[PDB]
Amino acid sequence: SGFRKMAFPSGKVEGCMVQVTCGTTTLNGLWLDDVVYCPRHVICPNYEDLLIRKSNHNFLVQAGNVQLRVIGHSMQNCVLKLKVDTANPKTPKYKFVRIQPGQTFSVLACYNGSPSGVYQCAMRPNFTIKGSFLNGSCGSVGFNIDYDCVSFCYMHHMELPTGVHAGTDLEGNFYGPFVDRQTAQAAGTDTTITVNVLAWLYAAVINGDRWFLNRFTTTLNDFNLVAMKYNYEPLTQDHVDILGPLSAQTGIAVLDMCASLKELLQNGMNGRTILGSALLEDEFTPFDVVRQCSGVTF
Amino acid sequence: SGFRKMAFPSGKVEGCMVQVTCGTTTLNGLWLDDVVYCPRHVICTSEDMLNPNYEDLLIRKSNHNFLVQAGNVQLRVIGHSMQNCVLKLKVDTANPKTPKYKFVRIQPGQTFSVLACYNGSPSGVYQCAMRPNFTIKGSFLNGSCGSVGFNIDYDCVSFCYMHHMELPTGVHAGTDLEGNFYGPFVDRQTAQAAGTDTTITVNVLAWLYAAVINGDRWFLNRFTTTLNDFNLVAMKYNYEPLTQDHVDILGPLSAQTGIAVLDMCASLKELLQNGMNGRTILGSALLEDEFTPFDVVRQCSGVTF
Ligand SMILES: CS(=O)(=O)Nc1ccc2c(NC(=O)[C@@H]3CN(S(=O)(=O)CC4(C#N)CC4)Cc4ccc(Cl)cc43)cncc2c1
Numbered sequence: 001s002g003f004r005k006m007a008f009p010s011g012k013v014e015g016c017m018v019q020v021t022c023g024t025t026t027l028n029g030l031w032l033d034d035v036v037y038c039p040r041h042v043i044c045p046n047y048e049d050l051l052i053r054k055s056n057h058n059f060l061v062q063a064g065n066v067q068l069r070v071i072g073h074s075m076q077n078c079v080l081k082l083k084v085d086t087a088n089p090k091t092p093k094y095k096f097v098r099i100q101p102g103q104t105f106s107v108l109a110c111y112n113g114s115p116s117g118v119y120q121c122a123m124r125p126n127f128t129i130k131g132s133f134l135n136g137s138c139g140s141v142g143f144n145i146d147y148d149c150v151s152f153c154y155m156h157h158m159e160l161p162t163g164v165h166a167g168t169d170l171e172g173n174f175y176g177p178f179v180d181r182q183t184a185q186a187a188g189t190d191t192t193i194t195v196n197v198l199a200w201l202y203a204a205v206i207n208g209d210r211w212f213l214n215r216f217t218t219t220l221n222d223f224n225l226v227a228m229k230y231n232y233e234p235l236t237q238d239h240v241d242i243l244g245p246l247s248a249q250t251g252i253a254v255l256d257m258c259a260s261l262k263e264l265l266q267n268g269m270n271g272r273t274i275l276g277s278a279l280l281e282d283e284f285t286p287f288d289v290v291r292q293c294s295g296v297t298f
Numbered sequence: 299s300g301f302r303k304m305a306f307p308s309g310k311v312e313g314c315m316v317q318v319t320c321g322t323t324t325l326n327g328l329w330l331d332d333v334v335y336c337p338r339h340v341i342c343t344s345e346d347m348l349n350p351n352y353e354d355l356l357i358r359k360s361n362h363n364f365l366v367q368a369g370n371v372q373l374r375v376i377g378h379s380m381q382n383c384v385l386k387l388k389v390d391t392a393n394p395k396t397p398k399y400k401f402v403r404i405q406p407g408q409t410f411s412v413l414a415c416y417n418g419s420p421s422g423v424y425q426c427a428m429r430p431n432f433t434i435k436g437s438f439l440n441g442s443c444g445s446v447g448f449n450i451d452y453d454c455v456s457f458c459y460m461h462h463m464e465l466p467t468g469v470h471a472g473t474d475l476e477g478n479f480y481g482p483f484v485d486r487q488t489a490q491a492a493g494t495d496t497t498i499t500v501n502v503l504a505w506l507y508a509a510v511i512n513g514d515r516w517f518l519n520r521f522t523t524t525l526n527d528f529n530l531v532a533m534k535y536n537y538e539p540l541t542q543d544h545v546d547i548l549g550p551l552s553a554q555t556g557i558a559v560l561d562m563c564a565s566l567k568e569l570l571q572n573g574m575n576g577r578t579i580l581g582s583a584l585l586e587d588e589f590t591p592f593d594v595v596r597q598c599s600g601v602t603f
């Protein structure tokens with residue numbers, strides 16, 4: 001029993017974190033085989049023009065106490081790829097994957113190539129992440145682990161004026177309409193991840209919390225008319241299909257759970273909590289709920 | 299900016315997790331140098347749990363009855379002894395991945411990371427606190443026994459908890475790494491109940507200072523309070539008494555923000571009286587008590603917004 005915001009074990013990622021210094025800027029890099037991946041703003045803007053002047057020895061790469069020697073450099077979108085002379089012996093099995101809004105991942109927050117903490121978070125519908133990062137965190141990475149394979153999905157680039165975070169996939173493509181420079185940048189209005197709230201309501205029923213259940217059902221259209229009024233993302237037939245296993249395990253149809261969510265949206269919790277929370281939680285996917293209520297190991 | 303429930307990087311602990319099997323029971327063990335530490339109830343059947351005589355069960359075991367698996371490698375057991383509620387299995391191979399470590403006993407209110415494991419394989423990491431009633435609100439399934447709690451300070455791992463049991467209420471109980479239970483619990487299936495839980499006041503105050511540091515002051519007021527008057531009100535909401543030590547510990551956060559501890563205590567008093575009125579503090583609708591004063595200083599910046 002119990003329900004915690006659980007992150008993946010970070011060990012496979014810790015052995016890839018390095019410190020990258022270019023002039024006065026110091027941030028984190030990801031060392032996989034003989035390449036170090038890091039935000040291209042470490043050289044800070046015409047990035048072709050800024051990069052062409054730099055030579056290999058301008059980049060200082062530190063892995064623990066060892067200094068790695070840079071032998072080549074290239075740019076891929078907003079990510080700088082530094083060819084080093086040593087392959088990382090601790091390189092895990094890995095893939096670079098682009099995630100979709102609503103999907104979750106673990107973040108290994110780092111400063112000076114040294115990991116300091118791990119937390120779980122979700123890619124918001126407005127493509128920002130509500131992370132916890134201080135100055136020097138740039139280059140910290142987001143990932144998921146599937147069996148022995150680490151799927152890297154995020155690299156931190158910047159903090160928006162509202163305290164939220166923006167970054168890229170490991171191929172350097174930003175999540176959201178963000179650019180990597182100091183300019184007027186604001187996150188769009190955020191919405192609640194409906195399929196995730198429903199998954200968390202199923203997790204609550206699995207842990208003995210059933211006070212919110214009712215005898216009523218709803219149509220997908222009527223639920224979406226109500227949900228769109230509380231700044232909730234539309235619920236699609238795919239979302240319903242994905243919630244299938246949780247519906248079969250508890251005996252509560254997805255549109256039956258939707259009628260409970262509709263009543264919680266119009267009436268609140270009345271001094272009650274669900275899984276120790278007074279708010280409706282949207283940072284656990286249907287897969288996360290299944291994994292935490294099954295026992296999948298890495 | 300931002301405030302998350304952050305766990306320590308688990309890598310140093312992942313390299314110590316092993317699977318321990320004795321007869322039909324399989325749980326997790328911690329492999330440090332040439333010793334594997336695990337709950338002594340690995341030698342029990344479910345029947346034995348009602349009134350287990352551990353000394354009588356242990357005397358009947360030989361080294362080869364314990365199967366220890368580290369990844370794909372089988373470790374050979376060459377000795378065994380019991381220390382309180384933990385079983386110490388001497389193995390013939392020292393763990394090459396043994397980090398710098400200490401065994402520390404924590405006090406209620408202190409936080410730590412938990413590396414949840416099944417079959418000697420780590421599956422997830424989360425942050426939690428030792429509750430005032432000595433239980434932990436963890437997330438553990440069958441096979442998680444032997445999972446460990448820890449903190450990391452520089453390169454040193456301080457092991458503080460080993461999971462032993464889930465109580466009928468869903469809360470978890472366990473021992474320090476010397477086998478001494480936290481709380482009045484026994485590794486016996488007896489009707490033992492967790493005492494009424496209370497809120498960790500010093501931690502809620504620390505989290506209110508964290509909100510002030512990240513730029514939020516809506517909850518502050520023009521009042522102060524005596525420590526005694528604060529405690530008379532706090533006890534009424536099932537909040538732990540705030541001691542002079544707690545006030546001393548909050549000193550640096552009071553100096554950083556310019557808000558005296560008893561001034562922050564007056565805001566807490568009023569928050570308990572009025573609730574939040576549709577507002578949140580650091581993205582939460584409840585008063586959070588699982589961040590210590592030390593955690594706040596660690597995660598939050600030295601410069602206030
Ligand atoms: C579906 S679940 O709730 O996740 N199931 C479990 C099962 C066993 C879990 C477990 N094991 C123990 O705590 C064992 C076995 N149990 S028990 O009765 O099976 C425990 C329960 C109760 N009430 C069912 C939950 C008695 C007992 C007494 C003393 C000592 Cl030292 C050890 C033990 C530890 N942590 C999480 C566990 C989740």
Ligand SMILES: [Cl-]
Nearest residue numbers: 403404405408
């Ligand atoms: Cl302590």
